[PDB]
Amino acid sequence: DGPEKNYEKTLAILQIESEKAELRLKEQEVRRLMRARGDGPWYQFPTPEKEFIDHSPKATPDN
Amino acid sequence: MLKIILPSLMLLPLTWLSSPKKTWTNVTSYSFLISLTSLTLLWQTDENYKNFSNMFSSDPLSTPLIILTAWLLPLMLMASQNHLKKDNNVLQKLYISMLISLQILLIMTFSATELIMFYILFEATLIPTLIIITRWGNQTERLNAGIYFLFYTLIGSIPLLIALILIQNHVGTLNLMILSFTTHTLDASWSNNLLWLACMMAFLIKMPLYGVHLWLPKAHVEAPIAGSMILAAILLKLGSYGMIRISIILDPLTKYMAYPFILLSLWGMIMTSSICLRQTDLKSLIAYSSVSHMALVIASIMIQTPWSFMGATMLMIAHGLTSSLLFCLANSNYERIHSRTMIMARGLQMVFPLMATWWLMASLANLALPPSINLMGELFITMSLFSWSNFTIILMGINIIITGMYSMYMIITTQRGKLTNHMINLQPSHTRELTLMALHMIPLILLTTSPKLITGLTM
Amino acid sequence: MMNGRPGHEPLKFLPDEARSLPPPKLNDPRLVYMGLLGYCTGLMDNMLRMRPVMRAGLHRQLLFVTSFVFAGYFYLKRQNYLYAVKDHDMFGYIKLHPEDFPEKEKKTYAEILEPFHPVR
Amino acid sequence: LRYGLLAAILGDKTTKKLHEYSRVITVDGNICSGKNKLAKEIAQQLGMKHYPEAGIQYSSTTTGDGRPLDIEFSGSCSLEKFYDDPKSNDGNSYRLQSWLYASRLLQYADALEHLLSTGQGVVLERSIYSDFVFLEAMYNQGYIRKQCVDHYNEIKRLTLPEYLPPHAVIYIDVPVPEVQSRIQKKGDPHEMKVTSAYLQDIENAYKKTFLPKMSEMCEVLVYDSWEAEDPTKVVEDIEYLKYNKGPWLKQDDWTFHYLRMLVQDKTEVLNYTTIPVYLPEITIGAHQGSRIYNSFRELPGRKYAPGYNAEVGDKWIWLK
Amino acid sequence: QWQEDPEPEDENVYAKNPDFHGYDSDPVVDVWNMRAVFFFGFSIVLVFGTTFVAYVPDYRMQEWARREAERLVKYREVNGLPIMESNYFDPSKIQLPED
Amino acid sequence: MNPITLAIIYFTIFLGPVITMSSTNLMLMWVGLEFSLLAIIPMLINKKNPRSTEAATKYFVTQATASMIILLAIVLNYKQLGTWMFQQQTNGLILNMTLMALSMKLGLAPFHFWLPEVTQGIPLHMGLILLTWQKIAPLSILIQIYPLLNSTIILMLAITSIFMGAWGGLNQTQMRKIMAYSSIAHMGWMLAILPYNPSLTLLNLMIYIILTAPMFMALMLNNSMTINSISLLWNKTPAMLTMISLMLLSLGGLPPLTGFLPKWIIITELMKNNCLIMATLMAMMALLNLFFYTRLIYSTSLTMFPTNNNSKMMTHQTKTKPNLMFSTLAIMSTMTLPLAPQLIT
Amino acid sequence: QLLREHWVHILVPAGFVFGCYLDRKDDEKLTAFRNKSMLFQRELRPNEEVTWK
Amino acid sequence: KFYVREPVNAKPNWLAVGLSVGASVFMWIYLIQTHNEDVLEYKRRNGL
Amino acid sequence: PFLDIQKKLGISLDRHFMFLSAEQPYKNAARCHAFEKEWIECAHGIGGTRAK
Amino acid sequence: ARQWQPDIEWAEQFSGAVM
Ligand SMILES: CCCCCCCCCCCCCCCCCC(=O)OC[C@H](COP(=O)([O-])OCC[N+](C)(C)C)OC(=O)CCCCCCCCCCCCCCCCC
Ligand SMILES: CCCCCCCCCCCCCCCCCC(=O)OC[C@H](COP(=O)(O)OCCN)OC(=O)CCCCCCCCCCCCCCCCC
Ligand SMILES: Nc1nc2c(ncn2[C@H]2C[C@H](O)[C@@H](COP(=O)(O)OP(=O)(O)OP(=O)(O)O)O2)c(=O)[nH]1
Ligand SMILES: [Mg+2]
């Protein structure tokens, strides 16, 4: 086919690999920041549920 | 690259679906055609490397190794055809499957553009060689040879895996071209020295140093002829290829970190040539000669000169061809006499004239003869080493003298002299094994005629 | 690590957001390899039971290949959903916290002085 | 394997299909004393199933085409060669004895499978409980050695207590000169070269060990020749026998079920006969073993599983 | 000792097939394997492959580099330019660090 | 036996880990562990030999002591916080006692001494049920408390389990003891990756289970107990040899078998968390594991050990091998490396 | 199926054709910078769809 | 009969054969239908 | 791991007695009902490190 | 020559439960 086909294919391959490397580094930094301070969707450790707290009036008023 | 890999993958269903009287013929013919197909990536007009895929790539360094592997598969089939004639058909097809899988995995290893995929295919090639050596070896020590080979390779390769994952976590990609372009200098710390050692010692085990080399003579003695062929012609060069690939990201500290291995290589090539002089086993002699030539390759890659890299590539291809030829000749004598003792068959030039001619040409290739790529590679390695330091010429000269001595000692003690007339069972010759010698030697002549192909990356 | 994300319905194989993603093309190397594994499973089963390796059990081999392709397709769609939602969460976090991920400006090879290490 | 836990749950109870003549009757005696005809007549007029004495070719006759295989496929015993020359340089006497023990074990497993599956009683000739008499005669005559005896005893300990003893043990006592005269009148040239000391050794092993050790777990019907050579008084004794001892009384449907599974899986039956104890009279070696195995697989009807052999039939090869 | 086959003697292969070619015991498969090895190994891969490699043009830009070097040398000679300037990159587009 | 008690015992064996992994109360996790132990004991002591009795006794006292320590940790947590789950602010002493007791339940070193003893003297299918199914419920509890674990104690237990498992499997010649030491090494890997990624220890657990299910199935086919017994497999079942060798290599972690994937991805995550020393030591002892696997391969596949006379009768008879279970798991445990991004989650 | 018998001789040629097809599919897969490199970047010609296929 | 004892499978287990063939056909049909529904839903959700 | 068949099926086998301030038998309290209620209502929705 | 295969010695070195 000629040298231009291999040239442009190499450029496309390099762009794909560079974007993948950038995204991998971004993923590492995002995971580290989330686990350091959990504020995104990931590393959300559980907590006792609100929906099983009895809010009805008790036998004792001081509750 | 897929147009080469996929026919070799379809070789296996051909092997298992062929009739038992047509299996060898079909597989040999189609593997020859696959080598002819694998000749198509020598079409390198531009300086740009042929990147076929996002995971497969070509190279002036990778291309001769791929072509040599694809050429060597039918040669292994021809060599291993005779010593499997009294065997079960399932075992024969399994042996052919082992050889074909070796060819597939080695082509993928040389064409791989990612270091982690290179590592995966590296150990994938580690498997069927172990199976071949242990399952079809002749003597008792094949199990010890397999253990030595396997665990030398694995203890080498585990720090390589740690280093590769470290590099991937640092730079993000572990792709060869991205690393080659945005390579980063190292700040010369002890961690970087250990990183250099971890990424070098796997390949320094795989092609033999003077230290760890003890697995190579055991594996070569105990292996069958196809196993000796594939080992001595591809796998040491696989270690060298890995060193050339991975040396690019270790720019500032190789120039002092390569000191012990250069000394180890030079003194070890002297000592192993000396062992070849006082060696009583023909396969051991060829194995230690392989250690010496690969020591030359180690020294050239360590000194990292363009002349050194070009000479390393030329010595890689030339040594693969001539070591396979020597192993095939020794195997022909061993199939005659069922013993590898060198002093026992002596006057074979009398009864085997053209086999003696192949012996003479193989030994003239073994020593450096100036119309040969062997001398081309050795001479340019010598030039680069003398540029590195002028005092290396003493070790080079001693090595060349002992190399000529053991090669001519081989010829004189196994071909010339009075014929051991008690050996009745000296069948005249097989057209198969004469063809095997010719298919080893004619590519040496053609590559001597045009050595621009065997020149590697640097020029 | 992604089990605690908001909107995570438990023990759900494919939520409706997965319906927003393009499915596998049904002839892609993952599913072709899964079918090949099913075929090899049938052949190995025949050889272990000491039957003809391919001449026997054609219905068994067909069932093996079909089941492997079926399960592989649905698992592959689930994994595509998981990778897509991981990328979505990462990009959303990047957009939410820009001060922790600065667009670092790289300069050309005309201001930086790379040290030169000669190989004499 | 059609029978299993599911079949037993759906109802295949051995105690449901049992019968007053669902007995295991083992006929025993010396080398030539009327036990082949006696077992035939007892099975004939009790409605049992007659199992003749398990020879070298028992597995060959009960598996495959049913024709006897080669002398290398079916062991390497050669009872004629044992009679011609014991104490050979190769171990032929113990190879023959161990192969006969394994063959008798397979026959006993087949008989138990038949009895537990159909309820019909079985009359065996010289079951596994009366093979150590031959082994001890071989050892005391010096034909084998203590290593062979220990290996046999180990295999017997591994295999024997997993089964059930016969309901009745009939014995035909006959003097050694009478056995010698019957052997000479039979006219077999190999069998004529037997030692009277060897026959007396077999009889002594019988009387000293087999009769009491089986009398403590089942009933014994020692007869003379004149009490025998008349297979009707024996049948009347069997009819009016009382089965009031032994492990056949303390077991139920599920013990029968697990025994039936263990006895219908023939590889589990013969598993402990192939222990890797490397006795040179028994072990073979890789090259001869692989040659014999490949030739046996190249025999007709033996290359694949018995449902799958196109050279002998089996038309529906592609749908099973 | 164990029951082992002895070591077999190796037969003279030319005693029954004097035209033996090294490949297979029966003559027909042997001669066809010889013909297949010679045709596919010498005729179509050692000749056609050699011709293909020989007629690969401008292998790694060697002839192109010859022509381009001749053109550049001729240009710089007839225009009086210093042939092969010492610095590759232009000094005006390189910024050096201060002091 | 008896079908009714078979159903009861096997249902309770199933029900134990299910309750443990599906219950959010630590008390219900503990009663699931108790269910698993008490249900699996009669399956252990079933042949009524002295070795079975000893194995059942050792297993009972070990798991009872470990479960008592677990219940101590649960009660102390309930005293400290009033809840029935370790939420975030429990005592590190309570958490370390939980980890130690669950390690003794799992059987990793230096609490590993009973595991080859119990696995020996027990039939092969019960060894399979133990070494696969009994290790999910304690691992489920460990995954539930994924943070708030002591990484120091985790890494010490992991490294000593991998070291001791490699050495023990190197020494042993009994197949069940070999499988137990393999279990100890792989549990060491899972515990190593536990505080950094629950997905990776789940992946390694699944790979180990699908790798050692057909190994035990192939042992169960010929009732092969020793290295010699598995060595005369070329005469018994010669079609088994390639799959046996490939699964042993996959248990060794050789590429390109899929058993390389768990070690590779665990090493990757530990590189991401900067534990290169632990990762390197673990990889070298995994090479030792591969050595004793390769000696097993030499015995069973690549050479032909001598056989005896009665194997001719064994070749005369016919056999039966489970469909849909052996071949499927063997193929998925050997040739599934290129599906690695799908396998990791 | 007129020839039959030795049907296995189409296996490796089929693999070769499929490999060439897969290489063509990978070339169609990359497709980026069709004329966007600084080196070539030529005009699209009066009768031409793409520079390389 | 060639064999002295009847083999366990001398005739096909037709229930198993029909069940396996029908399961394969049903799984292929369901797979093609759900792939068509998936591509239709994906195109409908984001345009074409 | 932690299966969630109780949340998937909507049942509550053991979820109504996880803590002190949860469904006492007749109408009673657990001596820290208000404090545990305030802590759980604080920690819900932000659980883990932020709740700590 | 003939390929060596393990003899009684090589086969008996793997018994003893300790190795
Ligand atoms: C077969 C050859 C064996 C001998 C030679 C093997 C290599 C020898 C030199 C390297 C050290 C040992 C291998 C480490 C592999 C990882 C290297 C690496 O990533 O280095 C960078 C890392 C450092 O990581 P780093 O570079 O990211 O460090 C952070 C640096 N800053 C902060 C500046 C960014 O090195 C290590 O972590 C080394 C720890 C090694 C701990 C384990 C040692 C085990 C025993 C040593 C020998 C093991 C092989 C022989 C076994 C016995 C055989 C008989
Ligand atoms: C690449 C990796 C290889 C790895 C191993 C591969 C093995 C399998 C090989 C398969 C086939 C591939 C062949 C590769 C070599 C091809 C040789 C060839 O034809 O080269 C081209 C050359 C003319 O090309 P040209 O451009 O002029 O050469 C460079 C000039 N600047 O052509 C010629 O000059 C003509 C050559 C053929 C004519 C006959 C030559 C006879 C030479 C006699 C030499 C006698 C002395 C030998 C001494 C030996 C001592 C040991
Ligand atoms: N060495 C040896 N020979 C045995 C064994 N079992 C049987 N034989 C021999 C003894 C006889 O020569 C031959 C036939 O056995 P029988 O006792 O059945 O003799 P035969 O059928 O001639 O007489 P019968 O009417 O049955 O009493 O087999 C055994 O375990 N070991
Ligand atoms: Mg008789």
Coordinates of all heavy atoms in Angstrom, one line a residue, chain F residues 183-221:
Chain F
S183 N -3.7 -25.5 49.4 CA -4.7 -24.7 50.0 C -4.2 -23.6 50.9 O -4.6 -22.5 50.9 CB -5.7 -25.6 50.8 OG -6.6 -24.8 51.5
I184 N -3.2 -24.0 51.7 CA -2.6 -23.0 52.6 C -1.9 -21.9 51.9 O -2.0 -20.7 52.2 CB -1.6 -23.8 53.6 CG1 -2.4 -24.7 54.5 CG2 -0.8 -22.8 54.4 CD1 -1.5 -25.8 55.1
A185 N -1.1 -22.3 50.8 CA -0.5 -21.2 50.0 C -1.4 -20.3 49.3 O -1.3 -19.1 49.3 CB 0.4 -21.9 49.0
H186 N -2.5 -20.9 48.7 CA -3.4 -20.0 48.0 C -4.3 -19.1 48.9 O -4.6 -18.0 48.6 CB -4.3 -20.9 47.1 CG -3.6 -21.5 45.9 ND1 -2.8 -22.6 46.1 CD2 -3.6 -21.1 44.6 CE1 -2.3 -22.9 44.9 NE2 -2.8 -22.0 44.0
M187 N -4.6 -19.7 50.1 CA -5.2 -18.9 51.2 C -4.3 -17.8 51.6 O -4.8 -16.7 52.0 CB -5.6 -19.7 52.3 CG -7.0 -20.4 52.2 SD -7.4 -21.1 53.8 CE -6.1 -22.3 53.9
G188 N -3.0 -18.0 51.6 CA -2.1 -16.9 51.9 C -2.1 -15.8 50.9 O -2.1 -14.6 51.3
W189 N -2.2 -16.2 49.6 CA -2.3 -15.2 48.6 C -3.6 -14.4 48.7 O -3.6 -13.1 48.6 CB -2.3 -15.8 47.2 CG -0.9 -16.1 46.7 CD1 -0.2 -17.3 46.9 CD2 0.0 -15.2 46.0 NE1 1.0 -17.1 46.3 CE2 1.2 -15.9 45.8 CE3 -0.2 -13.9 45.6 CZ2 2.2 -15.3 45.1 CZ3 0.9 -13.3 44.9 CH2 2.1 -14.0 44.6
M190 N -4.8 -15.1 49.0 CA -6.0 -14.4 49.2 C -6.0 -13.4 50.3 O -6.5 -12.3 50.2 CB -7.2 -15.4 49.4 CG -7.4 -16.4 48.2 SD -8.7 -17.5 48.6 CE -7.8 -19.1 48.4
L191 N -5.5 -13.9 51.5 CA -5.4 -13.0 52.7 C -4.5 -11.9 52.4 O -4.7 -10.8 52.9 CB -4.9 -13.9 53.8 CG -5.3 -13.2 55.2 CD1 -6.8 -13.3 55.4 CD2 -4.6 -13.9 56.3
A192 N -3.4 -12.1 51.6 CA -2.5 -11.0 51.3 C -3.2 -9.9 50.5 O -3.0 -8.7 50.9 CB -1.3 -11.5 50.4
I193 N -4.1 -10.2 49.6 CA -4.7 -9.2 48.8 C -6.0 -8.7 49.5 O -6.7 -7.8 48.9 CB -5.0 -9.7 47.4 CG1 -5.1 -8.5 46.4 CG2 -6.2 -10.6 47.3 CD1 -4.0 -7.5 46.5
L194 N -6.4 -9.3 50.6 CA -7.7 -8.9 51.2 C -7.9 -7.5 51.6 O -8.9 -6.9 51.3 CB -7.9 -9.9 52.4 CG -9.1 -9.5 53.3 CD1 -10.4 -9.8 52.5 CD2 -9.1 -10.3 54.6
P195 N -6.9 -6.8 52.3 CA -7.2 -5.4 52.7 C -7.2 -4.4 51.6 O -7.5 -3.2 51.9 CB -6.2 -5.1 53.8 CG -5.6 -6.4 54.1 CD -5.6 -7.2 52.9
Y196 N -6.7 -4.7 50.5 CA -6.5 -3.8 49.4 C -7.6 -3.9 48.3 O -8.0 -2.9 47.7 CB -5.2 -3.9 48.7 CG -4.0 -3.9 49.7 CD1 -3.5 -5.1 50.2 CD2 -3.5 -2.7 50.2 CE1 -2.4 -5.1 51.1 CE2 -2.5 -2.7 51.1 CZ -1.9 -3.9 51.5 OH -0.9 -3.9 52.4
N197 N -8.1 -5.1 48.1 CA -9.1 -5.4 47.1 C -9.9 -6.6 47.4 O -9.4 -7.7 47.4 CB -8.5 -5.5 45.7 CG -9.4 -5.0 44.6 OD1 -10.6 -5.0 44.7 ND2 -8.8 -4.7 43.5
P198 N -11.2 -6.5 47.8 CA -12.0 -7.7 48.0 C -12.3 -8.5 46.7 O -12.5 -9.7 46.7 CB -13.3 -7.2 48.6 CG -13.0 -5.7 48.9 CD -12.0 -5.3 47.9
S199 N -12.3 -7.7 45.6 CA -12.6 -8.3 44.3 C -11.4 -9.3 43.9 O -11.7 -10.4 43.3 CB -12.7 -7.3 43.2 OG -13.6 -6.2 43.7
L200 N -10.2 -9.0 44.3 CA -9.1 -9.8 43.9 C -9.0 -11.1 44.7 O -8.6 -12.2 44.2 CB -7.8 -9.1 43.9 CG -7.8 -7.9 42.9 CD1 -6.4 -7.3 42.8 CD2 -8.2 -8.4 41.5
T201 N -9.3 -11.0 46.0 CA -9.4 -12.2 46.8 C -10.6 -13.1 46.4 O -10.5 -14.3 46.4 CB -9.4 -12.0 48.3 OG1 -10.0 -13.1 49.0 CG2 -10.2 -10.8 48.6
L202 N -11.7 -12.5 46.0 CA -12.8 -13.3 45.5 C -12.4 -14.0 44.2 O -12.7 -15.1 44.0 CB -14.0 -12.4 45.2 CG -14.8 -12.1 46.5 CD1 -15.9 -11.1 46.2 CD2 -15.4 -13.4 47.0
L203 N -11.6 -13.3 43.3 CA -11.2 -13.8 42.1 C -10.2 -15.0 42.3 O -10.3 -16.0 41.7 CB -10.5 -12.8 41.2 CG -9.8 -13.3 39.9 CD1 -10.9 -13.7 38.9 CD2 -9.0 -12.2 39.3
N204 N -9.3 -14.8 43.2 CA -8.3 -15.9 43.5 C -9.0 -17.0 44.2 O -8.6 -18.2 43.9 CB -7.2 -15.3 44.5 CG -6.1 -16.3 44.6 OD1 -5.9 -17.2 43.9 ND2 -5.2 -16.0 45.6
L205 N -10.0 -16.8 45.0 CA -10.8 -17.9 45.6 C -11.5 -18.7 44.5 O -11.5 -19.9 44.5 CB -11.8 -17.3 46.6 CG -12.7 -18.3 47.3 CD1 -12.0 -19.4 48.1 CD2 -13.7 -17.6 48.1
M206 N -12.1 -18.0 43.6 CA -12.8 -18.7 42.5 C -11.9 -19.5 41.6 O -12.2 -20.6 41.2 CB -13.6 -17.7 41.6 CG -14.8 -17.1 42.3 SD -16.0 -18.4 42.9 CE -16.4 -19.2 41.3
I207 N -10.7 -18.9 41.3 CA -9.7 -19.6 40.5 C -9.2 -20.8 41.2 O -9.1 -21.9 40.6 CB -8.6 -18.6 40.1 CG1 -9.0 -17.6 39.1 CG2 -7.4 -19.4 39.5 CD1 -9.5 -18.1 37.8
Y208 N -8.9 -20.7 42.5 CA -8.5 -21.8 43.3 C -9.5 -22.9 43.3 O -9.2 -24.1 43.3 CB -8.1 -21.4 44.7 CG -7.9 -22.5 45.6 CD1 -6.8 -23.3 45.6 CD2 -8.9 -22.8 46.6 CE1 -6.6 -24.4 46.4 CE2 -8.7 -23.9 47.4 CZ -7.6 -24.6 47.3 OH -7.4 -25.7 48.2
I209 N -10.8 -22.5 43.5 CA -11.8 -23.5 43.6 C -12.0 -24.3 42.3 O -12.1 -25.5 42.3 CB -13.1 -22.8 44.1 CG1 -13.1 -22.5 45.6 CG2 -14.3 -23.7 43.8 CD1 -14.2 -21.7 46.1
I210 N -12.1 -23.5 41.2 CA -12.3 -24.2 39.9 C -11.0 -24.9 39.5 O -11.0 -25.7 38.5 CB -12.7 -23.3 38.8 CG1 -11.6 -22.3 38.4 CG2 -13.9 -22.5 39.2 CD1 -11.8 -21.5 37.1
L211 N -9.9 -24.6 40.1 CA -8.6 -25.4 39.8 C -8.5 -26.7 40.6 O -8.1 -27.7 40.1 CB -7.4 -24.5 40.1 CG -6.8 -23.9 38.8 CD1 -5.8 -22.8 39.2 CD2 -6.2 -24.9 38.0
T212 N -8.9 -26.7 41.9 CA -8.8 -27.8 42.7 C -10.0 -28.7 42.8 O -10.0 -29.8 43.4 CB -8.4 -27.4 44.1 OG1 -9.2 -26.4 44.6 CG2 -6.9 -27.0 44.1
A213 N -11.2 -28.3 42.2 CA -12.3 -29.2 42.0 C -11.9 -30.3 41.1 O -12.1 -31.5 41.5 CB -13.5 -28.4 41.6
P214 N -11.4 -30.1 39.9 CA -11.1 -31.2 39.0 C -9.9 -32.0 39.4 O -9.8 -33.2 39.0 CB -11.0 -30.6 37.6 CG -11.3 -29.2 37.7 CD -11.0 -28.9 39.1
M215 N -8.9 -31.4 40.1 CA -7.8 -32.2 40.7 C -8.4 -33.2 41.6 O -8.0 -34.4 41.6 CB -6.9 -31.2 41.4 CG -5.9 -30.6 40.5 SD -4.8 -31.8 39.7 CE -4.2 -32.7 41.1
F216 N -9.3 -32.8 42.5 CA -9.9 -33.8 43.4 C -10.8 -34.8 42.7 O -10.8 -36.0 43.0 CB -10.7 -33.1 44.5 CG -9.9 -32.8 45.7 CD1 -9.5 -31.6 46.1 CD2 -9.5 -33.9 46.6 CE1 -8.7 -31.3 47.2 CE2 -8.7 -33.7 47.7 CZ -8.3 -32.4 48.0
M217 N -11.4 -34.3 41.6 CA -12.2 -35.3 40.8 C -11.4 -36.3 40.1 O -11.7 -37.5 40.1 CB -13.0 -34.5 39.8 CG -14.2 -33.7 40.3 SD -14.9 -32.5 39.2 CE -16.2 -31.8 40.2
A218 N -10.2 -35.9 39.6 CA -9.3 -36.9 39.0 C -8.7 -37.8 40.0 O -8.3 -39.0 39.7 CB -8.2 -36.1 38.2
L219 N -8.4 -37.3 41.2 CA -8.0 -38.2 42.3 C -9.1 -39.2 42.6 O -8.9 -40.4 42.9 CB -7.6 -37.4 43.5 CG -6.3 -36.6 43.4 CD1 -5.9 -36.0 44.7 CD2 -5.2 -37.4 42.7
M220 N -10.4 -38.7 42.7 CA -11.5 -39.5 43.0 C -11.8 -40.6 42.0 O -12.4 -41.6 42.3 CB -12.7 -38.6 43.2 CG -12.9 -38.0 44.5 SD -14.0 -36.6 44.5 CE -15.4 -37.3 43.8
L221 N -11.4 -40.4 40.7 CA -11.7 -41.3 39.6 C -11.1 -42.7 39.9 O -11.7 -43.7 39.8 CB -11.3 -40.8 38.3 CG -11.8 -41.7 37.2 CD1 -13.4 -41.7 37.2 CD2 -11.3 -41.3 35.8

